[PDB]
Design an enzyme around this catalytic site. Structure first.
Site, PDB file in Angstrom:
ATOM      1  N   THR A 173       0.845  -1.175   0.000  1.00  0.00           N
ATOM      2  CA  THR A 173       0.000   0.000   0.000  1.00  0.00           C
ATOM      3  C   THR A 173       0.892   1.241   0.000  1.00  0.00           C
ATOM      4  O   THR A 173       1.678   1.443   0.925  1.00  0.00           O
ATOM      5  CB  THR A 173      -0.881   0.012   1.169  1.00  0.00           C
ATOM      6  OG1 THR A 173      -1.676  -1.172   1.095  1.00  0.00           O
ATOM      7  CG2 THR A 173      -1.768   1.236   1.184  1.00  0.00           C
ATOM      8  N   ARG A 182     -10.947  10.709   8.985  1.00  0.00           N
ATOM      9  CA  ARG A 182     -12.258  10.115   8.765  1.00  0.00           C
ATOM     10  C   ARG A 182     -13.251  10.730   9.754  1.00  0.00           C
ATOM     11  O   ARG A 182     -13.316  10.327  10.927  1.00  0.00           O
ATOM     12  CB  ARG A 182     -12.139   8.572   8.850  1.00  0.00           C
ATOM     13  CG  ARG A 182     -11.253   8.018   7.694  1.00  0.00           C
ATOM     14  CD  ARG A 182     -11.460   6.521   7.507  1.00  0.00           C
ATOM     15  NE  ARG A 182     -11.286   5.839   8.783  1.00  0.00           N
ATOM     16  CZ  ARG A 182     -10.099   5.652   9.358  1.00  0.00           C
ATOM     17  NH1 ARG A 182      -8.994   6.064   8.748  1.00  0.00           N
ATOM     18  NH2 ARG A 182     -10.003   5.041  10.537  1.00  0.00           N
ATOM     19  N   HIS A 189      -8.078   4.675  -2.732  1.00  0.00           N
ATOM     20  CA  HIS A 189      -8.206   4.005  -1.402  1.00  0.00           C
ATOM     21  C   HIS A 189      -9.652   4.115  -0.920  1.00  0.00           C
ATOM     22  O   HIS A 189      -9.965   4.431   0.268  1.00  0.00           O
ATOM     23  CB  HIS A 189      -7.244   4.620  -0.375  1.00  0.00           C
ATOM     24  CG  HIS A 189      -6.817   3.685   0.745  1.00  0.00           C
ATOM     25  ND1 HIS A 189      -5.534   3.177   0.797  1.00  0.00           N
ATOM     26  CD2 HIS A 189      -7.453   3.249   1.870  1.00  0.00           C
ATOM     27  CE1 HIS A 189      -5.456   2.359   1.855  1.00  0.00           C
ATOM     28  NE2 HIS A 189      -6.563   2.462   2.572  1.00  0.00           N
ATOM     29  N   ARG A 197     -10.872   7.160   1.174  1.00  0.00           N
ATOM     30  CA  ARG A 197     -10.528   7.193   2.593  1.00  0.00           C
ATOM     31  C   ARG A 197      -9.200   7.872   2.890  1.00  0.00           C
ATOM     32  O   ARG A 197      -8.831   8.065   4.064  1.00  0.00           O
ATOM     33  CB  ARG A 197     -10.438   5.740   3.081  1.00  0.00           C
ATOM     34  CG  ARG A 197     -11.772   5.077   2.985  1.00  0.00           C
ATOM     35  CD  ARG A 197     -11.682   3.604   3.331  1.00  0.00           C
ATOM     36  NE  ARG A 197     -11.368   3.280   4.727  1.00  0.00           N
ATOM     37  CZ  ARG A 197     -12.283   3.181   5.700  1.00  0.00           C
ATOM     38  NH1 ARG A 197     -13.545   3.429   5.477  1.00  0.00           N
ATOM     39  NH2 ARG A 197     -11.877   2.800   6.896  1.00  0.00           N
ATOM     40  N   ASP A 252      -9.584  -0.169  -8.383  1.00  0.00           N
ATOM     41  CA  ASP A 252     -10.660  -0.359  -7.424  1.00  0.00           C
ATOM     42  C   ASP A 252     -11.375   0.908  -7.151  1.00  0.00           C
ATOM     43  O   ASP A 252     -11.011   1.965  -7.716  1.00  0.00           O
ATOM     44  CB  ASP A 252     -10.176  -1.073  -6.164  1.00  0.00           C
ATOM     45  CG  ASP A 252      -9.304  -0.231  -5.247  1.00  0.00           C
ATOM     46  OD1 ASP A 252      -9.259   1.041  -5.383  1.00  0.00           O
ATOM     47  OD2 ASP A 252      -8.761  -0.838  -4.267  1.00  0.00           O
ATOM     48  N   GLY A 308     -15.568   1.464  -5.761  1.00  0.00           N
ATOM     49  CA  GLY A 308     -16.951   1.482  -6.197  1.00  0.00           C
ATOM     50  C   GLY A 308     -17.423   0.405  -7.105  1.00  0.00           C
ATOM     51  O   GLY A 308     -18.497   0.554  -7.685  1.00  0.00           O
ATOM     52  N   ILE A 309     -16.656  -0.656  -7.323  1.00  0.00           N
ATOM     53  CA  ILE A 309     -17.071  -1.750  -8.181  1.00  0.00           C
ATOM     54  C   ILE A 309     -18.206  -2.493  -7.414  1.00  0.00           C
ATOM     55  O   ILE A 309     -17.983  -2.967  -6.330  1.00  0.00           O
ATOM     56  CB  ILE A 309     -15.968  -2.713  -8.499  1.00  0.00           C
ATOM     57  CG1 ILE A 309     -14.798  -2.029  -9.225  1.00  0.00           C
ATOM     58  CG2 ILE A 309     -16.508  -3.885  -9.327  1.00  0.00           C
ATOM     59  CD1 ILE A 309     -15.045  -1.430 -10.606  1.00  0.00           C
ATOM     60  N   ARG A 310     -19.394  -2.500  -7.968  1.00  0.00           N
ATOM     61  CA  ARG A 310     -20.594  -3.006  -7.250  1.00  0.00           C
ATOM     62  C   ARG A 310     -21.416  -3.948  -8.152  1.00  0.00           C
ATOM     63  O   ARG A 310     -22.598  -4.176  -7.812  1.00  0.00           O
ATOM     64  CB  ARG A 310     -21.566  -1.847  -6.833  1.00  0.00           C
ATOM     65  CG  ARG A 310     -21.088  -0.733  -5.905  1.00  0.00           C
ATOM     66  CD  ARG A 310     -20.594  -1.285  -4.573  1.00  0.00           C
ATOM     67  NE  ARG A 310     -19.802  -0.337  -3.684  1.00  0.00           N
ATOM     68  CZ  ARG A 310     -18.490  -0.331  -3.498  1.00  0.00           C
ATOM     69  NH1 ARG A 310     -17.638  -1.206  -4.173  1.00  0.00           N
ATOM     70  NH2 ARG A 310     -18.000   0.605  -2.586  1.00  0.00           N
ATOM     71  N   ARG A 334     -15.733  -2.900   0.084  1.00  0.00           N
ATOM     72  CA  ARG A 334     -16.910  -2.775   0.926  1.00  0.00           C
ATOM     73  C   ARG A 334     -17.990  -3.855   0.669  1.00  0.00           C
ATOM     74  O   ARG A 334     -18.488  -4.430   1.682  1.00  0.00           O
ATOM     75  CB  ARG A 334     -17.502  -1.389   0.930  1.00  0.00           C
ATOM     76  CG  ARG A 334     -16.613  -0.340   1.541  1.00  0.00           C
ATOM     77  CD  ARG A 334     -17.236   1.020   1.357  1.00  0.00           C
ATOM     78  NE  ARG A 334     -16.431   2.095   1.929  1.00  0.00           N
ATOM     79  CZ  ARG A 334     -15.595   2.851   1.179  1.00  0.00           C
ATOM     80  NH1 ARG A 334     -15.381   2.550  -0.111  1.00  0.00           N
ATOM     81  NH2 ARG A 334     -15.009   3.898   1.685  1.00  0.00           N
TER      82      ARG A 334
HETATM   83  C1  FMN Z   1     -12.991  -0.580   6.300  1.00  0.00           C
HETATM   84  C2  FMN Z   1     -11.868  -0.516   5.293  1.00  0.00           C
HETATM   85  C3  FMN Z   1     -10.584  -0.892   5.636  1.00  0.00           C
HETATM   86  C4  FMN Z   1      -9.541  -0.893   4.733  1.00  0.00           C
HETATM   87  N1  FMN Z   1      -8.326  -1.309   5.045  1.00  0.00           N
HETATM   88  C5  FMN Z   1      -7.296  -1.284   4.118  1.00  0.00           C
HETATM   89  C6  FMN Z   1      -5.927  -1.735   4.395  1.00  0.00           C
HETATM   90  O1  FMN Z   1      -5.657  -2.219   5.550  1.00  0.00           O
HETATM   91  N2  FMN Z   1      -5.023  -1.681   3.391  1.00  0.00           N
HETATM   92  C7  FMN Z   1      -5.278  -1.158   2.139  1.00  0.00           C
HETATM   93  O2  FMN Z   1      -4.336  -1.104   1.335  1.00  0.00           O
HETATM   94  N3  FMN Z   1      -6.512  -0.768   1.817  1.00  0.00           N
HETATM   95  C8  FMN Z   1      -7.501  -0.787   2.743  1.00  0.00           C
HETATM   96  N4  FMN Z   1      -8.758  -0.393   2.421  1.00  0.00           N
HETATM   97  C9  FMN Z   1      -9.077   0.097   1.026  1.00  0.00           C
HETATM   98  C10 FMN Z   1      -9.547  -1.082   0.149  1.00  0.00           C
HETATM   99  O3  FMN Z   1      -8.449  -1.982  -0.084  1.00  0.00           O
HETATM  100  C11 FMN Z   1     -10.054  -0.592  -1.220  1.00  0.00           C
HETATM  101  O4  FMN Z   1      -9.035   0.217  -1.850  1.00  0.00           O
HETATM  102  C12 FMN Z   1     -11.237   0.304  -1.130  1.00  0.00           C
HETATM  103  O5  FMN Z   1     -12.173  -0.129  -0.123  1.00  0.00           O
HETATM  104  C13 FMN Z   1     -11.773  -0.054  -2.522  1.00  0.00           C
HETATM  105  O6  FMN Z   1     -12.982   0.255  -2.720  1.00  0.00           O
HETATM  106  P1  FMN Z   1     -14.435  -0.360  -2.493  1.00  0.00           P
HETATM  107  O7  FMN Z   1     -14.575  -0.572  -1.003  1.00  0.00           O
HETATM  108  O8  FMN Z   1     -15.179   0.794  -2.994  1.00  0.00           O
HETATM  109  O9  FMN Z   1     -14.662  -1.589  -3.329  1.00  0.00           O
HETATM  110  C14 FMN Z   1      -9.822  -0.443   3.351  1.00  0.00           C
HETATM  111  C15 FMN Z   1     -11.095  -0.103   2.997  1.00  0.00           C
HETATM  112  C16 FMN Z   1     -12.149  -0.092   3.938  1.00  0.00           C
HETATM  113  C17 FMN Z   1     -13.552   0.310   3.570  1.00  0.00           C
HETATM  114  O1  HFA Z   2      -8.657   2.727   4.795  1.00  0.00           O
HETATM  115  C1  HFA Z   2      -7.734   2.169   5.412  1.00  0.00           C
HETATM  116  O2  HFA Z   2      -6.701   1.661   4.901  1.00  0.00           O
HETATM  117  C2  HFA Z   2      -7.823   2.173   6.921  1.00  0.00           C
HETATM  118  O3  HFA Z   2      -9.121   2.610   7.292  1.00  0.00           O
HETATM  119  C3  HFA Z   2      -7.456   0.801   7.489  1.00  0.00           C
HETATM  120  C4  HFA Z   2      -7.328   0.942   9.002  1.00  0.00           C
HETATM  121  C5  HFA Z   2      -8.448   0.839   9.758  1.00  0.00           C
HETATM  122  C6  HFA Z   2      -8.368   0.968  11.151  1.00  0.00           C
HETATM  123  C7  HFA Z   2      -7.142   1.222  11.752  1.00  0.00           C
HETATM  124  C8  HFA Z   2      -6.014   1.337  10.971  1.00  0.00           C
HETATM  125  C9  HFA Z   2      -6.121   1.167   9.584  1.00  0.00           C
END
Ligand code: FMN
Ligand code: HFA
Ligand code: FMN
Ligand code: FMN
Ligand code: FMN
Ligand code: HFA
Ligand code: HFA
Ligand code: HFA
Ligand code: HFA
Ligand code: HFA
Ligand code: HFA
Ligand code: HFA
Lengths: 331, 331, 331, 331
Positions: B152, B161, B228, B231, B259, B261-263, B283
């Site tokens: 990442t 957030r 991401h 986020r 990636d 929003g792919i639903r 998600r």
């Molecule tokens: C709750 C949550 C936690 C996530 N944790 C990580 C993580 O630990 N590492 C990372 O590279 N991406 C993380 N992501 C991002 C996802 O890998 C992905 O890029 C993002 O959710 C993609 O989109 P989608 O949820 O719209 O399908 C996280 C996403 C969410 C919603």
């Molecule tokens: O989008 C992400 O990658 C983070 O929300 C993942 C994460 C969640 C909670 C605590 C630390 C890291």
């Protein structure tokens, strides 16, 4: 009825919910369904003024025959779903209006009965399971006096219609495929049809420019630029958005029709100005059928006829050919 | 469940509000979160017709292995937040569907247990505090049979957030970072990882074209074009909007995933048509997990599999490679 | 307060309606007011990854002095309308945050008192009735230690503010123009100011490219690309929409600032990426003042400082100069 | 009244519903009606600063005469529908404001009575049934002192106004076509008019560029770029969207006016900046008439006069010619 939208409300009142949904719905999230209307709404016409309108005519010649409007009734399966007289009511009104009527492979009245009504019937083909039966259906249609074969090319199988799934919708026991007691089509299937009829073959459901040109090369007499009313691939581009590019690419090599969301004479004018030879109209014909049977479809077709003439003359066009030379602007 | 949206409602019902928000939320004003969906919705596919569909296959080869769909489960930290079986439930369903599962650095079950499930695990890396520990995590993953390192690269630190801040959200005492008893990554960190594994290194969170080309130059075996999930930087462009330009710039030099929003299977098709080798899905997998555990994820993956095959064939594609050659139009 | 929007609600609660409207409103139909926000919302940043962030700094040098952020407090007349300490509260918080504070010609505390607070005061000029008095105000400001003259060039007279007209709004008897006991500016007025001070002259309210170039030719040390927060010509283009073209046209010949709708550190980043040297922020500073006096403005400035640093590093920028080299994409 | 929108509400209160609808409505789905406003709302002006505004003037010379504003009252049939004094009230207010008033062929007071009011009357022509009567109307107008013939060229017949159809609206027995006790116009009709008057002939309802150039070639002294307030072809492009291209094509060969949705002095400025010589204003004049008779129209015209001067000076324009040299940006 002074617009096509009055008819939709009247159909919603009379039809059972699940049948209204069968009619109205599209595939997936209904993105392509909605986009058909959005796309038309973005198009503005640049009208011409001060031209001779002494003999405005909406007639066109298509597939060897005069039609009263640049429009045909689209194929819509199982029309007894909407009214007890089904396809015969629609075909009678079309005949009387001078508009071609497309008889379906999945008609709820037999193709021979429908064609006996007279008028300018066309026949829509779904490719069957085997080449010989497909070609039998084509021969039946030709023997019955149909004037074109509308080969549906966008249904290797059916789209996932979530309204129907949620409704658990199924054909009532009182509606049957009256032409009977299916498989993906290919270009080889097109050739088999072309080799076995002297009628013009019209490929319905073309969206890519390369497919339009290949259709000409394949000996098609027309195409219908269409996303199948948003009922097949959800996310397929609206036909109206491809039409201009496709008309330029075929450069007069076949008739180019369009469908999807045509709901007024102004919409017909837009399609014409983008280069369409004619349009198909689906759902509104079924609304008029549901609401008032034969006389309902007749009223719809008269309202469209008046709206098309109105629009043409307000835009300075004495003929459909002149309407094709109008320019447009996107909003 | 006949769409992925049924699952979201079912997850909202069962999860505590603050956990649902942790899952759903983005950074800032959620502009990038919303834009991921907007962007996909603007894309229309131009389907091809009349091609041979006798052997439609959704399989791809990626990072040395066959996958059943052009899709992997995205890394999502702390999956025991959503269900008691957490990552094992998800990894089992992925294995059984033939989809790669991305094991997180912040997994709530240890990477070795998850990998013991079997299937095609990948491992996502967050860069630690020190080079030696980072590289230990990588070695653990490789020793456990992971097939790719998903580094990442868009999290020098975490995005702000506001849902979590307002909720005063914190990890429950019953969820821990099971791989343990962090620092900004740089290109030097990428090289350290590349030098210490024989696995393909995939940089997740690339948006600039110059960064995609440098990733190739750096010896990456792939990238994930991603903001991401909205986020990280609020106002970052959606990956789908950069994808076409990035695919043209790498000119086959590494796999290019996307990636955000792919639903649906139609969304997969859009990403493919824009040039993606495969997508990640985040998600929705967690919604299915929350709603119905392992069997919930299995059902989601089967629905996606059917939707991807549906979409491909309606678009005239017998293979994912053919889907990549589709053209698109913006609406 | 975790966003600037929390502060707006808190200000709406405490201020009398007609004062809130004086603050919030624009001219005409408020088209330009709304467009300032729309325009920012269309801009997406393309972030860079994997750069060294070991020493991220938000500092800039401007008009001879270090500032802590690429931001200044915009001129806002009559700040005792919003809180009893008025301009002194705002100027103290700005000083303590290391952000320049713009003292107004129509300040409700005298320019000398405000400047005595310390920090990096600038002085905004409205052109008076006569050249000699205008120039007296400029000399007073320079004698008091102001570091730049912000000459407002977009107010030959005031815009028609329909909220104020409807409210029959008028300055309370307890607020006065403390610098006293006006006329359209021209390029000749600019020259008179330039000839009479050694301070950098900054023309605030430039939107046309030709006016930006003439400002350089005229010896301006900066401009503020601005539609005056939608309070002057209703239908004037937002500054952010002209900024890129104006930065290219001056080609380093003066500092180019922007204002209008900047409400977060992500917005600052957008303005920087489009080429701005720095931004001004108006209404949000007054919301924080209304809600919590000095400490309210201090909290706002700390939240902006953290949001700007956050955004910069998530976008791979260790300095404001690097942020200026980011690319953008319109949504 | 501090905007034109206050007047609309006041008119809605006093007029019978079906008369309000006659006034407000357009043809078809009202797409062109709505687009007139949308189009104006997309236009932003790029104002100039620091110009001499010592003698700002809104006057123009048009069709041989000074007008106080770059504006005329559009032809609106049957003004006794809205107030008992009808056209005389409007013509008196226009005279007193120094704005040309367009007397209609279908005026509810005779053209000779209206012209007796004085001011700068123009006369609008609907082409009749026969060339000799049409030309009689033109001669009457010229004999009465009208200064231009505004030949309406976009009404070969009337648009389908669905509000009126639904309302079953018909002229009350107390309103008559006071000029009496119709046919499509052509270019031959234009020539017949041109040959029989020494007044400038102005073709109202031109949208195509080729028609604008032919109008010049035909000896027109002006055109009005117009979709007839969205009351003729539903789907006709707004005039404002064609104006720039049409002004470039005539290259000074005739005056180019525009109408459709002009509701403020800022809108006048937009039209000017796009290249219009002057605008027409229709519906708002009738709102002011309905609400307050002569004095109502006078107040409207004074508010527009002040808004036009306001806008011009805020944009750095001392004259209408300078306003024409402003640039615009689409939002
Ligand atoms: C709750 C949550 C936690 C996530 N944790 C990580 C993580 O630990 N590492 C990372 O590279 N991406 C993380 N992501 C991002 C996802 O890998 C992905 O890029 C993002 O959710 C993609 O989109 P989608 O949820 O719209 O399908 C996280 C996403 C969410 C919603
Ligand atoms: O989008 C992400 O990658 C983070 O929300 C993942 C994460 C969640 C909670 C605590 C630390 C890291
Ligand atoms: C209920 C329904 C049934 C249909 N059946 C068929 C069919 O049997 N064959 C076919 O080629 N198209 C079929 N279509 C698609 C129509 O021919 C047409 O492409 C689509 O409805 C056009 O759009 P419109 O309804 O927006 O006017 C059907 C459409 C609907 C709504
Ligand atoms: C209540 C109020 C008073 C203002 N007074 C002045 C002024 O005296 N001089 C000036 O040049 N700008 C003035 N401005 C405009 C601001 O300097 C700034 O351009 C505008 O508010 C910037 O946008 P923002 O409020 O959206 O951040 C004022 C703005 C507001 C809202
Ligand atoms: C009630 C009504 C009656 C009209 N009558 C005429 C007419 O007799 N001749 C004509 O050329 N235009 C006529 N018009 C069109 C106007 O001249 C003008 O083009 C249109 O109203 C301009 O737009 P506006 O109302 O948006 O300002 C009429 C418009 C309205 C609303
Ligand atoms: O859109 C179409 O073409 C199909 O819905 C027609 C059809 C309806 C019902 C059953 C089979 C086929
Ligand atoms: O690219 C083109 O030329 C058409 O897709 C534009 C268009 C959009 C919407 C409706 C019709 C036409
Ligand atoms: O500039 C381009 O080529 C893409 O950003 C266009 C795009 C917009 C939205 C979604 C996908 C693609
Ligand atoms: O926007 C501006 O610049 C003015 O509102 C400032 C001002 C307020 C009140 C009185 C005079 C001047
Ligand atoms: O023409 C351009 O290049 C900018 O007006 C585009 C833009 C739109 C909106 C916001 C910022 C920039
Ligand atoms: O828009 C127009 O020009 C017509 O509505 C004028 C008119 C009204 C009523 C009757 C005839 C003519
Ligand atoms: O093509 C052009 O140049 C104008 O149609 C653009 C425009 C759109 C909307 C309003 C005015 C102008």
């Amino acid at each position: 009825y002074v617009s096509l939208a009055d008819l939709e409300r009247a159909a919603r009142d009379v039809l059972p919910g699940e049948i209204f949904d069968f009619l109205a719905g599209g595939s997936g999230t209904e993105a392509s369904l909605v986009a058909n209307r959005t796309a038309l709404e973005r198009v503005f016409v640049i009208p011409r003024m001060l031209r001779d309108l002494t003999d405005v005519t909406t007639e066109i010649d298509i597939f060897g025959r005069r039609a009263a409007l640049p429009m045909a009734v689209a194929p819509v399966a199982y029309q007894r779903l909407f009214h007890p007289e089904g396809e015969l009511a629609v075909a009678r009104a079309a005949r009387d209006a001078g508009v071609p009527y497309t008889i379906c492979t999945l008609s709820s009245v037999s193709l021979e009965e429908i064609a006996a009504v007279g008028g300018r019937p066309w026949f829509q083909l779904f490719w069957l399971r085997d080449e010989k039966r497909s070609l039998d259906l084509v021969r039946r249609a030709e023997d019955a006096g149909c004037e074109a074969i509308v080969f549906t090319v966008d249904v290797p199988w059916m789209g996932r219609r979530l309204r129907d799934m949620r409704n658990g919708f199924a054909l009532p026991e009182w509606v049957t495929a009256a032409n009977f007691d299916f498989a993906p089509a290919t270009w080889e299937s097109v050739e088999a049809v072309r080799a076995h009829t002297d009628l013009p073959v019209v490929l319905k459901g073309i969206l890519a420019v390369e497919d339009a040109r290949r259709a000409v090369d394949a000996g098609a007499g027309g195409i219908v630029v269409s996303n199948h009313g948003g009922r097949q691939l959800d996310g397929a581009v609206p036909g109206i958005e491809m039409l201009g590019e496709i008309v330029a690419a075929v450069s007069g090599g076949c008739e180019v029709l369009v469908d999807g969301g045509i709901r007024s004479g102004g919409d017909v004018l837009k399609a014409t100005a983008l280069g369409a030879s004619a349009v198909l109209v689906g759902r509104p014909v079924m609304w008029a059928l549901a609401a008032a049977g034969q006389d309902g479809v007749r009223q719809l077709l008269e309202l469209l006829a008046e709206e098309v003439r109105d629009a043409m003359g307000l835009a300075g066009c004495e003929s459909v050919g002149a309407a094709r030379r109008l320019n447009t602007k996107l909003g």
